[PDB]
Amino acid sequence: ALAAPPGELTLALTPDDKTLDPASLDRALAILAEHGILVLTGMLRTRLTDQLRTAMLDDLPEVLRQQDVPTNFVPGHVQQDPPVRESLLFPDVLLNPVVYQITHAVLGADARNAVYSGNMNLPGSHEQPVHLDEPHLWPGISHPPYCLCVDVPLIDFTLENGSTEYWPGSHVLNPDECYDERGCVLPAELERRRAVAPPVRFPIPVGSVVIRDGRLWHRGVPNLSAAPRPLLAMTHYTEWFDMPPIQLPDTVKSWVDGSDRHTHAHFVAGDVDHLTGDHPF
Amino acid sequence: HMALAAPPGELTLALTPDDKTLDPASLDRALAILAEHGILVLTGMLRTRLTDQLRTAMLDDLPEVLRQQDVPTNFVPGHVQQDPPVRESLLFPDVLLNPVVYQITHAVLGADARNAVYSGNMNLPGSHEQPVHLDEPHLWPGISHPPYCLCVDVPLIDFTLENGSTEYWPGSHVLNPDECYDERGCVLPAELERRRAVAPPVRFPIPVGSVVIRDGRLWHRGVPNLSAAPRPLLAMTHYTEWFDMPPIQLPDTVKSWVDGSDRHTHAHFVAGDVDHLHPFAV
Numbered sequence: 233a234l235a236a237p238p239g240e241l242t243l244a245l246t247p248d249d250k251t252l253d254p255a256s257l258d259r260a261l262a263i264l265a266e267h268g269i270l271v272l273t274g275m276l277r278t279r280l281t282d283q284l285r286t287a288m289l290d291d292l293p294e295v296l297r298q299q300d301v302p303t304n305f306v307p308g309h310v311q312q313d314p315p316v317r318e319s320l321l322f323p324d325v326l327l328n329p330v331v332y333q334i335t336h337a338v339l340g341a342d343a344r345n346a347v348y349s350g351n352m353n354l355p356g357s358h359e360q361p362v363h364l365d366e367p368h369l370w371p372g373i374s375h376p377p378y379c380l381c382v383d384v385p386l387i388d389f390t391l392e393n394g395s396t397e398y399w400p401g402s403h404v405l406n407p408d409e410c411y412d413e414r415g416c417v418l419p420a421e422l423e424r425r426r427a428v429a430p431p432v433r434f435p436i437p438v439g440s441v442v443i444r445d446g447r448l449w450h451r452g453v454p455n456l457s458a459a460p461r462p463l464l465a466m467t468h469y470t471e472w473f474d475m476p477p478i479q480l481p482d483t484v485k486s487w488v489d490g491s492d493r494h495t496h497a498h499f500v501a502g503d504v505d506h507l508t509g510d511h512p513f
Numbered sequence: 514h515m516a517l518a519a520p521p522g523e524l525t526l527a528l529t530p531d532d533k534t535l536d537p538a539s540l541d542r543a544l545a546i547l548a549e550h551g552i553l554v555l556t557g558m559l560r561t562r563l564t565d566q567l568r569t570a571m572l573d574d575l576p577e578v579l580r581q582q583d584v585p586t587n588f589v590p591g592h593v594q595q596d597p598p599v600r601e602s603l604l605f606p607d608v609l610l611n612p613v614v615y616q617i618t619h620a621v622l623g624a625d626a627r628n629a630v631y632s633g634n635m636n637l638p639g640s641h642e643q644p645v646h647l648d649e650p651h652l653w654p655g656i657s658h659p660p661y662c663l664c665v666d667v668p669l670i671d672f673t674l675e676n677g678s679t680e681y682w683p684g685s686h687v688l689n690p691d692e693c694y695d696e697r698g699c700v701l702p703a704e705l706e707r708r709r710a711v712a713p714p715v716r717f718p719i720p721v722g723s724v725v726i727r728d729g730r731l732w733h734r735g736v737p738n739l740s741a742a743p744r745p746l747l748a749m750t751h752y753t754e755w756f757d758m759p760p761i762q763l764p765d766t767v768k769s770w771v772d773g774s775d776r777h778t779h780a781h782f783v784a785g786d787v788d789h790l791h792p793f794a795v
């Protein structure tokens with residue numbers, strides 16, 4: 233439990249920073265390689281995070297009204313996709329030049345975003361088990377990254393309101409009998425790892441982007457504030473990793489499909505139902 | 514290269530078409546051969562009734578393939594990419610869903626491994642020499658990692674040293690030094706000569722009815738067919754569930770037995786016929 237993002241994991245940026253100088257990029261990649269998690273503070277304008285926060289809080293009633301509310305492991309951790317309306321699809325969020333500079337260097341120039349989702353942590357939420365979002369590709373084998381989660385807090389994350397617990401360096405661990413069918417870490421391996429490299433939790437100011445190995449051990453924790461804690465979630469994969477495409481309206485096709493910052497996208501005529509995924513074509 | 518009179522014993526498991534399963538010792542030997550050498554020859558797997566129909570169908574299609582404006586060719590003249598027909602009458606469970614093949618690919622790639630290729634290589638008389646290449650790259654440069662794909666090659670005639678039996682580089686499937694491969698999967702000549710000194714390539718006859726299973730990363734090349742008859746090969750490739758591939762187009766008249774199976778196929782089922790006569794030509 234820290235007062236701020238630890239300097240060992242953190243690069244302090246401004247929203248005007250378009251690309252890292254070679255020394256900054258080398259430090260960014262050294263942090264991801266060693267720790268599996270990188271915090272970039274001050275990247276997104278409050279204008280963008282304000283609109284995304286508002287849109288997801290406005291959508292929450294429609295999510296909670298569903299017959300079965302999609303939940304991550306335990307009560308209060310709701311899966312919620314942000315809107316894919318043209319007015320809420322921002323190049324600086326989907327196609328951030330600093331994020332893609334980092335993901336291109338780790339995953340290659342053909343790396344592609346294939347997730348546009350979110351994690352709404354409700355007041356009174358329960359403790360998640362420690363897990364990874366994406367598995368190792370073979371059991372018992374050491375291999376490099378094939379995916380980088382890109383997490384965008386939409387309010388100030390604090391120790392009180394459910395700032396994620398991260399397990400530094402856990403992204404390289406893949407012993408036999410380590411993971412169950414839900415990507416939860418088997419308790420024996422949790423405790424062995426805790427003795428060598430215990431987890432961390434820290435406040436993350438809104439405007440930050442967290443880039444982490446998709447294999448990093450982490451868990452959502454109780455939100456003990458009065459307000460829901462929204463996170464917007466993206467994940468960059470190597471070109472060769474099979475993912476369903478992100479459904480986007482064809483009104484963003486002009487700037488999404490042009491880019492050398494690739495998205496695995498399917499462009500739809502008219503509006504996408506971002507909550508039910510249940511539009512006709 | 515080393516020119517042999519038969520498939521070498523070190524790379525070969527002799528079966529009959531009645532063999533539905535390898536006993537544990539045979540399976541262990543099969544996996545040890547794939548791990549060490551990256552290529553396994555299984556003789557006597559397919560009935561002549563099946564290979565006769567597939568051979569006939571591909572030779573009958575060849576005129577229509579060669580009549581096209583732009584003939585899909587692998588690297589050099591005479592190595593033609595040709596899909597076998599996906600008519601229901603020529604789609605055989607013992608070819609698409611072979612129990613011995615999937616026993617081996619399940620053990621190497623997992624129970625979720627899937628066939629995502631149903632294609633072919635027609636080697637024409639007077640064909641040229643291909644450069645040495647791999648069909649599927651390593652997933653990261655400079656890194657050692659296990660297999661993610663197994664090519665399943667079905668000769669549709671007897672392959673001989675004369676009619677273009679493939680050159681294979683045994684043990685080459687684990688080699689991934691920096692700056693080894695170009696954008697077409699060709700091996701840098703400097704790495705070819707370093708490797709040749711330690712483990713030279715081999716060419717050998719393979720009788721029709723055989724199935725060749727090899728690491729998709731194995732170094733190989735098509736060679737000149739010096740006979741007067743085209744040399745047809747039917748080609749399939751099993752991949753880990755997580756490797757992105759376009760689906761095989763199949764008619765919905767095989768959906769009942771293909772889509773049921775615990776021998777997975779990455780398939781898109783179409784109403785009516787597929788026009789099989791190219792995305793896999795390099």
Ligand SMILES: NC[C@H]1O[C@H](O[C@H]2[C@H](O)[C@@H](O[C@H]3O[C@H](CO)[C@@H](O)[C@H](N)[C@H]3O)[C@H](N)C[C@@H]2N)[C@H](N)[C@@H](O)[C@@H]1O
Nearest residue numbers: 304311347349350351365366367381413414415465467
């Ligand atoms: N950080 C972004 C998001 O990450 C997780 O979603 C992930 C899944 O974890 C992953 O699934 C993997 O894990 C499961 C168990 O290992 C397997 O069934 C599955 N076959 C395997 O590919 C999908 N491929 C992609 C999806 N975006 C969280 N739930 C989600 O709330 C969060 O926003």
Ligand SMILES: NC[C@H]1O[C@H](O[C@H]2[C@H](O)[C@@H](O[C@H]3O[C@H](CO)[C@@H](O)[C@H](N)[C@H]3O)[C@H](N)C[C@@H]2N)[C@H](N)[C@@H](O)[C@@H]1O
Nearest residue numbers: 587630632633634648649664696697698748793794795
């Ligand atoms: N043994 C079966 C077949 O294998 C090869 O075809 C392969 C391609 O090689 C492969 O492509 C890979 O290698 C390319 C060339 O470098 C890269 O561009 C590409 N990114 C990379 O995925 C495709 N994915 C699948 C296709 N079946 C031969 N060509 C073909 O004649 C033969 O019948």
Ligand code: NI
Nearest residue numbers: 363364365450
């Ligand atoms: Ni998670």
Ligand code: NI
Nearest residue numbers: 647648733735
């Ligand atoms: Ni080839």
